[PDB]
Design an enzyme around this catalytic site. Structure first.
Site, short mmCIF file in Angstrom:
data_model
loop_
_atom_site.label_atom_id
_atom_site.label_comp_id
_atom_site.label_asym_id
_atom_site.label_seq_id
_atom_site.Cartn_x
_atom_site.Cartn_y
_atom_site.Cartn_z
N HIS A 32 27.11 44.00 12.45
CA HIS A 32 28.27 44.03 11.65
C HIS A 32 28.14 43.38 10.26
O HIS A 32 27.30 42.18 10.41
CB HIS A 32 29.49 43.43 12.41
CG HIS A 32 29.88 44.53 13.31
ND1 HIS A 32 31.24 45.25 13.36
CD2 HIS A 32 29.55 44.61 14.70
CE1 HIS A 32 31.26 45.71 14.51
NE2 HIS A 32 30.30 45.63 15.30
N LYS A 51 26.78 51.39 5.61
CA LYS A 51 27.78 50.51 5.43
C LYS A 51 29.00 51.41 5.77
O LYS A 51 29.08 52.33 5.05
CB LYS A 51 27.65 49.52 4.37
CG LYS A 51 26.54 48.76 4.27
CD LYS A 51 26.79 47.47 3.34
CE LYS A 51 27.52 46.30 4.18
NZ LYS A 51 27.68 45.24 3.01
N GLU A 98 19.11 51.86 1.02
CA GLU A 98 17.73 51.50 1.28
C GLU A 98 17.66 50.86 2.73
O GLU A 98 18.00 49.73 2.75
CB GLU A 98 16.94 50.98 0.23
CG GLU A 98 15.47 50.78 0.60
CD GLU A 98 14.87 49.76 -0.35
OE1 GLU A 98 15.45 49.32 -1.47
OE2 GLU A 98 13.53 49.63 -0.57
N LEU A 99 16.94 51.62 3.57
CA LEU A 99 16.92 51.12 4.95
C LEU A 99 15.91 49.94 5.14
O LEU A 99 14.74 50.17 4.48
CB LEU A 99 16.36 52.03 6.11
CG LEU A 99 16.62 51.49 7.57
CD1 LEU A 99 17.83 50.96 8.07
CD2 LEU A 99 15.78 52.42 8.49
N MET A 100 15.96 48.75 5.46
CA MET A 100 15.24 47.64 5.46
C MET A 100 14.64 47.48 7.09
O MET A 100 15.10 46.94 7.82
CB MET A 100 15.77 46.49 4.85
CG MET A 100 16.10 46.94 3.36
SD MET A 100 14.95 46.76 2.45
CE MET A 100 14.13 45.15 2.06
N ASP A 145 25.93 33.56 -3.19
CA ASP A 145 25.68 33.64 -1.87
C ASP A 145 24.24 33.75 -1.43
O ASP A 145 23.87 34.51 -0.44
CB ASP A 145 26.55 34.70 -1.13
CG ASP A 145 26.73 34.15 0.39
OD1 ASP A 145 26.37 33.08 0.90
OD2 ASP A 145 27.27 35.33 1.04
N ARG A 149 20.11 34.87 5.48
CA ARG A 149 20.96 35.99 6.05
C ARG A 149 21.40 37.29 5.19
O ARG A 149 21.68 38.29 5.77
CB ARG A 149 22.40 35.42 6.57
CG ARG A 149 23.37 34.95 5.60
CD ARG A 149 24.56 34.62 6.18
NE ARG A 149 25.31 33.90 5.04
CZ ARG A 149 25.12 32.48 4.53
NH1 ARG A 149 24.42 31.77 5.30
NH2 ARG A 149 25.92 32.15 3.38
N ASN A 150 21.28 37.01 3.87
CA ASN A 150 21.39 38.03 2.86
C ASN A 150 20.03 38.67 2.24
O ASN A 150 20.29 39.50 1.58
CB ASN A 150 22.60 37.50 1.64
CG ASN A 150 23.80 37.12 2.28
OD1 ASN A 150 24.21 36.05 1.65
ND2 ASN A 150 24.41 37.84 3.31
N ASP A 166 22.95 41.68 0.22
CA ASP A 166 24.16 41.85 0.29
C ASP A 166 25.02 40.97 -0.96
O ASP A 166 24.28 40.29 -1.58
CB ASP A 166 24.74 40.67 1.35
CG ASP A 166 26.07 40.72 1.67
OD1 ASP A 166 26.69 39.91 1.17
OD2 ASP A 166 26.70 41.26 2.59
C1 LIG Z 1 20.30 42.76 10.50
C2 LIG Z 1 19.44 44.12 10.48
C3 LIG Z 1 19.28 44.77 9.51
C4 LIG Z 1 18.62 45.97 9.15
N1 LIG Z 1 18.47 46.72 8.27
C5 LIG Z 1 19.33 46.80 7.22
N2 LIG Z 1 20.45 46.18 7.40
C6 LIG Z 1 21.50 46.14 6.41
N3 LIG Z 1 22.48 45.45 6.24
C7 LIG Z 1 23.20 44.97 7.47
C8 LIG Z 1 22.79 45.05 8.71
C9 LIG Z 1 23.48 44.71 9.79
C10 LIG Z 1 24.44 43.64 9.61
C11 LIG Z 1 24.72 43.45 8.54
C12 LIG Z 1 24.21 43.93 7.42
S1 LIG Z 1 24.98 43.59 5.79
O1 LIG Z 1 24.63 44.40 5.06
O2 LIG Z 1 26.17 43.20 5.82
C13 LIG Z 1 24.09 42.16 5.11
C14 LIG Z 1 24.61 41.09 6.21
C15 LIG Z 1 22.60 42.37 4.89
C16 LIG Z 1 21.17 46.71 5.25
C17 LIG Z 1 21.55 46.84 3.96
N4 LIG Z 1 20.74 47.50 3.26
N5 LIG Z 1 19.65 47.90 3.89
C18 LIG Z 1 19.91 47.64 4.98
N6 LIG Z 1 19.02 47.40 6.11
C19 LIG Z 1 18.03 46.24 10.71
O3 LIG Z 1 17.08 47.48 10.38
C20 LIG Z 1 16.33 48.01 11.50
C21 LIG Z 1 16.10 49.27 11.51
C22 LIG Z 1 15.40 47.06 11.60
C23 LIG Z 1 18.26 45.45 11.79
C24 LIG Z 1 18.84 44.37 11.53
C25 LIG Z 1 18.89 43.38 13.14
C26 LIG Z 1 17.97 42.45 13.08
C27 LIG Z 1 18.00 41.71 14.57
N7 LIG Z 1 18.08 42.74 15.53
C28 LIG Z 1 16.60 43.29 15.94
C29 LIG Z 1 19.05 43.47 15.55
C30 LIG Z 1 18.96 44.44 14.22
#
Ligand SMILES: Cc1cc(Nc2nc(Nc3ccccc3S(=O)(=O)C(C)C)c3c[nH]nc3n2)c(OC(C)C)cc1C1CCN(C)CC1
Length: 294
Positions: A32, A51, A98-100, A145, A149-150, A166
């Protein structure tokens, strides 16, 4: 259409790239964000982070969501996640990023901690984020910020690139001019004295937060100010208190942190100077040959 201004250019909902809903597929939940769930998805294929905006939300939440899309779509820098587009004409509304594939930096550091990663990997993450921060500074954008975490990583392995992913706090201040939250939700542990005391924010606010990020990086993902609460941190920092070096932290790296945490904003380095200092650390064999704790 609320308007959004960045680098002297104005944009609105109409300038966002609307992606047809039929071209978007969700694969799995990633956790989330601020509003709702974030998913791994696919477009038309482009790998994306999706998102979402909860359908049960206030009109303010919708406007906050639109502003987030406008903010990210207007940046153009390799160390800030790209925005593929949006899907605002179907419910639930989406922002496509963009997927990270390396996930967030905080979880990457905790998970990839050497167990029974090297100093250069940490310095490259730091330089990457400093580059993104310098781009924000040169474009007069205050992040507010900067924190692990960002930050996100392109991949877990070698060649990973760290990016700022973020802009929630910045968006909150853009719309209202003040902070949705309250004292308990403020990122106290990342803020300089003039910010939490006077509500004064400049790019030197981001310098201080970057110093805290550097500590999060070189500690391998620990929470800043171990065992201290937000109020304890506020009192400690205002009285001149600073964190100790993380375990095994090279002296030249710790000195960048202490320079980021100078009490007076005018005594803190700008991001061009921070980058030069990180670059010099990467050149120093005594820094990069330091073993990380296991
Ligand atoms: C946290 C996260 C992010 C991404 N990839 C991503 N995530 C964005 N956002 C985002 C994601 C979740 C929560 C809040 C935000 S957010 O946007 O609110 C901010 C807190 C970053 C992305 C935004 N743009 N690209 C993103 N990629 C990810 O990609 C997978 C495909 C590796 C895996 C994980 C976790 C890591 C820990 N374990 C394994 C569980 C999975």
């Amino acid at each position: 259409n609320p308007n959004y201004c960045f680098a002297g250019k104005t944009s609105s909902i109409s300038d966002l790239k609307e992606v047809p809903r039929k071209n978007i597929t969700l694969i799995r939940g990633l956790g989330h964000g601020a509003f709702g769930e974030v998913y791994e998805g696919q477009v038309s294929p482009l790998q994306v982070a999706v998102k979402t905006l909860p359908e049960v939300c206030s009109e303010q939440d919708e406007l906050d969501f639109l502003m987030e899309a406008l903010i990210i779509s207007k940046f153009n820098h390799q160390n800030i996640v790209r925005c593929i587009g949006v899907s605002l004409q179907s419910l639930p509304r989406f922002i496509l990023l963009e997927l990270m594939a390396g996930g967030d930096l905080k979880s990457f550091l905790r998970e990839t901690r050497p167990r029974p990663l090297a100093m250069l990997d940490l310095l490259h993450v730091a330089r990457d984020i400093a580059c993104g921060c310098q781009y924000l500074e040169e474009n007069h954008f205050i992040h507010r910020d900067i924190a692990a975490r960002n930050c996100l990583l392109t991949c877990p392995g070698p060649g990973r690139v760290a990016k700022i992913g973020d802009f929630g706090m910045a968006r909150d201040i853009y719309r209202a001019g003040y902070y949705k939250g309250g004292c308990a939700m403020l990122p106290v542990k990342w803020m300089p004295p003039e910010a939490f005391m006077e509500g004064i924010f400049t790019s030197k606010t981001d310098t201080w937060s970057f110093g805290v990020l550097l500590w999060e990086i070189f500690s391998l993902g620990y929470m800043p100010y171990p065992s201290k609460s937000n109020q304890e941190v506020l009192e400690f920092v205002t009285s001149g208190g600073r964190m100790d070096p993380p375990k095994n932290c090279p002296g030249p790296v710790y000195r960048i942190m202490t320079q980021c945490w100078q009490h007076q904003p005018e005594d803190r380095p700008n991001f061009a100077i921070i980058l030069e200092r990180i670059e010099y650390c990467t050149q120093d064999p005594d820094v990069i040959n330091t073993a990380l704790p296991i």
